[model samples]
Target: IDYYDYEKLLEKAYQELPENVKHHKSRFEVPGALVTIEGNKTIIENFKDIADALNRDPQHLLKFLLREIATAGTLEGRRVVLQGRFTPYLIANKLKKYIKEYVICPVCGSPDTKIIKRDRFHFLKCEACGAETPIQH
Candidate 1:
């Protein structure tokens, strides 16, 4: 099911959880994306964005969100598709910190890379070896 359907079910289940377990208070739909949380307005384009926004590793964040939402029953291979107005500025701003510190080429271990935009995807082209890699989560 889509996020809207999952969200309604999630909120209902959330009421049965302990007070300390509640994190998201609202879910905002942005075309194909859903921003889920309270206080801070964070857009989850992909699952990785949720981790970056929370400053936690994506895997860890996924586990936490799943556990909190009590969806471990049907979570296997579940994919959340994100769609919305394309805004590079928002993603770039959030990614700048990681870009500055960790967007190195895995092959040559070089940080001399530029972000390449092709259609809707972002890639990194390494200047040292001319290798292109998909941007890391």
Candidate 2:
């Protein structure tokens, strides 16, 4: 696994986050909100396939995915609610391109880093430096 500067990514995400959303560092499970690991895993795996086929990084792919999931809603009254309806997959794909264009490997300054989904968490690995960095969602 390659190493990455996840702290920097988290900071950037936090800075770009909207005012209505709240950030929490711990695991907070909401009741009645079905957390389907298999479904999410499939989504992530499909994304990885696309990244691989396109010669892109999977970590970057997941960053955009998480951003959309978060936008769907906050944990409210045992349910994760969305403020409004949005095309999550489309938005995520668009954001993926933007992230790929801008994000670079902090170690080797390479644009070859890719996203890896492990146990439902997203990690970024630098293709040049062989460094692994985690992405905070």
Candidate 3:
């Protein structure tokens, strides 16, 4: 049950119980990649939308976008402009792959993860389950 609904089932004395403590929860959700090709440039129209959904830095997500498409890109206001023509399906596939490796927590399937670096290695550390999985550098 959701927090508010769960709280309503409790007695008034326990109403303050939930009011005083933090609860483990799933909040953010991954958004679909919204991409369109304009001439030779591929634009992710909802670029910030996906980033906000992932609760990640746009710059960080941009790095993966450029790499997956093997092209140069820039953020123009809200859209991400890539230098080459690309298919929306391809972009969406890459985004799913990126979320699997970088956004979703490997152990708990939670998106509450952070990328951590130790020396030359990169790790995806999940705040939900305290699991750490190494990612490519």
Candidate 4:
């Protein structure tokens, strides 16, 4: 008897939820690094693809990583070559951190955001919710 009552409440709860919560139109996934170790250097083969997917310039991403890891690197063709050998895990973690800080919108939790610069300061402009958030690093 109580089991039937629980089922009835569950059905009503589901109906009360918004469609956006129930069905996802677009999903944001963190991209992973495809890395290779060559001698004393580490290379990311799909560096451009990752930056493209993030909708940010490769140089901006490169600058963030170089500063975060405190290493020297250069964008070569479709890849990035770093001076130090780093594992895929470390690289992936850095990319994720970059997405959280630079990509995702704090107001609406959307990844459809762009970085805007004005007066030597950076701001995150969200296309999804029209929010302008100041970002550092």
> Please, what are the lDDT tens digits per residue for candidate 3 over residues 63-129?
9878877999888677898889888877876776676678766567667778777768677678878
User: By descending TM-score, how would the candidates be arranged?
Assistant: 4, 3, 2, 1
Q: Per-prediction RMSD in angstroms?
A: 17.5, 15.9, 10.8, 8.7
Which candidate, 1 or 2, would have the higher TM-score against the true structure? 2
Once fitted onto the true fold, the runs of candidate 3 whose alpha carbons sit more than 4 angstroms away are 1-28
Which window of ten consecutive residues has the lowest lDDT sum in model 3? 15-24
Candidate 4 per-residue lDDT over residues 2-113, each given as its tens digit: 6669888887766533222322433344355799989999999899988888788889999989988977999978799999989988887688778778877766876688
lDDT of candidate 3 at residue 65, scale 0 to 100: 76
TM-score of each: 0.27, 0.30, 0.73, 0.77
Off by over 4 Å in 2: 1-54, 57-103, 118-120
Each candidate structure's count of clashing pairs: 1, 13, 0, 0
Residue 84, candidate 1: C-alpha displacement in angstroms: 28
Tens digits of per-residue lDDT, candidate 2, 21-118, equal 21332111211112223423322223333444445544544445446455433332222333444344444344444344434444555445665666
Inter-residue clash pairs, candidate 3: none
By lDDT rank, best first, the candidates go 4, 3, 2, 1
For model 2, what is the C-alpha lDDT against the true structure?
0.43
Best by TM-score: 4
The TM-score obtained by model 3 is: 0.73
User: How far in Å is the alpha carbon of 98 misplaced in model 3?
Assistant: 0.5
lDDT winner between candidates 2 and 3 = 3
